[PDB]
Amino acid sequence: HHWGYGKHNGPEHWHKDFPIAKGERQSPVDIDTHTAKYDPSLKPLSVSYDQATSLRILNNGHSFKVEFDDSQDKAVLKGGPLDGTYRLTQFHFHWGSLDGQGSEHTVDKKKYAAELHLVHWNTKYGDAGKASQQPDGLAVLGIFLKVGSAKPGLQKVVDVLDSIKTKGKSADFTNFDPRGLLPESLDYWTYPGSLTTPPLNECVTWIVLKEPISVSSEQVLKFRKLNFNGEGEPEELMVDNWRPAQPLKNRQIKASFK
Numbered sequence: 071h072h073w074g075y076g077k078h079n080g081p082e083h084w085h086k087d088f089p090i091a092k093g094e095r096q097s098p099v100d101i102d103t104h105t106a107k108y109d110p111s112l113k114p115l116s117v118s119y120d121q122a123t124s125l126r127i128l129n130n131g132h133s134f135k136v137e138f139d140d141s142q143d144k145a146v147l148k149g150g151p152l153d154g155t156y157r158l159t160q161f162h163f164h165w166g167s168l169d170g171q172g173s174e175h176t177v178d179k180k181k182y183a184a185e186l187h188l189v190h191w192n193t194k195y196g197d198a199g200k201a202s203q204q205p206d207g208l209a210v211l212g213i214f215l216k217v218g219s220a221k222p223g224l225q226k227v228v229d230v231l232d233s234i235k236t237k238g239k240s241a242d243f244t245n246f247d248p249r250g251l252l253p254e255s256l257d258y259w260t261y262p263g264s265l266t267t268p269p270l271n272e273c274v275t276w277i278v279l280k281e282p283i284s285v286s287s288e289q290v291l292k293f294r295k296l297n298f299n300g301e302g303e304p305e306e307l308m309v310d311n312w313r314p315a316q317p318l319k320n321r322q323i324k325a326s327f328k
C-alpha cells in the first residue's frame with residue numbers, strides 16, 4: 071500500500087509514513103502576491119544550461135522525469151537567493167485532469183494547468199542523496215504552465231510519452247535542451263520549503279517564476295494519456311498528481327521584483 075494521489079493513499083495520508091508532512095517548512099504553498107516582500111538584495115537568478123546532457127526519461131508511477139548527467143558541472147543554477155552552485159539532476163511535471171487545476175504552488179489561490187520542477191542539488195554536498203539531508207541541499211526552479219499556444223521546446227518530450235505509458239517504463243532521451251522550457255522573465259518568488267512528494271524532506275530552496283509558459287491543449291492531452299498503473303493492472307490515467315498548498319507557518323515569501 072504505497073503512496074500516490076488517490077483517495078486512500080493521497081496527500082492527506084502521507085503523514086503516516088512521512089510525519090514530516092506536518093512539518094514547519096512544507097511545500098507547496100499559496101503565494102499571496104500582495105504579502106510577498108520585494109527584496110532588493112536578491113540577485114538575478116543565473117541559469118546556465120548550455121552544456122546540459124539529458125540521459126533518459128522514466129514513468130515512475132507518480133510523474134514522468136527526465137534525468138541528466140550530473141557527474142560534472144554542466145547545467146547549473148546559482149545566484150538568486152542561493153549561496154554556491156546547484157547541479158540540475160532531473161525535471162518532471164505535475165498536472166491536472168482539467169486545465170483549472172494541476173499546479174502545486176498557487177498564486178493568490180489561482181491554480182495553473184501544470185507545474186514544471188527543475189531539481190538541482192548543492193554541489194557542496196557532493197551528491198543529490200547527501201544534499202537531500204541538508205536544509206540548503208536542493209533548489210527547485212518551478213515554472214507554471216497555462217494552456218494556450220504550444221511550447222515548441224516541449225514537443226520532443228510529449229512525442230516520446232507514448233513509449234513510457236505505464237509505471238516502470240523508461241527510454242533513452244538524449245540531447246534535450248531544457249532552455250526551451252523557460253519563459254522570457256526570470257523574475258521569481260522564493261521561500262524555504264520541502265519536496266512536494268514523499269519523503270517530503272525539508273531540504274529545498276524554492277524559486278518559483280512569476281511568468282508562466284504556455285503549452286497547447288494537444289501537449290497537455292499527451293500528459294493525461296500516461297498511466298499511474300503498471301502494464302496489466304487496471305488502467306488509471308496519470309492526472310491530478312499534485313499536492314495541495316500547505317500551511318505557510320513561520321515563513322516569508324520574498325519577491326525578486328517590484
Ligand SMILES: NS(=O)(=O)c1ccc(C(=O)CSc2ncccn2)cc1Cl
Binds near residue numbers: 187208210274
Ligand atoms: N516535486 S519536487 O519537490 O520537485 C521533488 C520530487 C521528488 C524528488 C525526489 O528526489 C524523490 S526520491 C528521494 N528524495 C529525497 C531523498 C531520497 N529520495 C525531489 C524533488 Cl525536489
Ligand SMILES: [Zn+2]
Binds near residue numbers: 163
Ligand atoms: Zn515536483
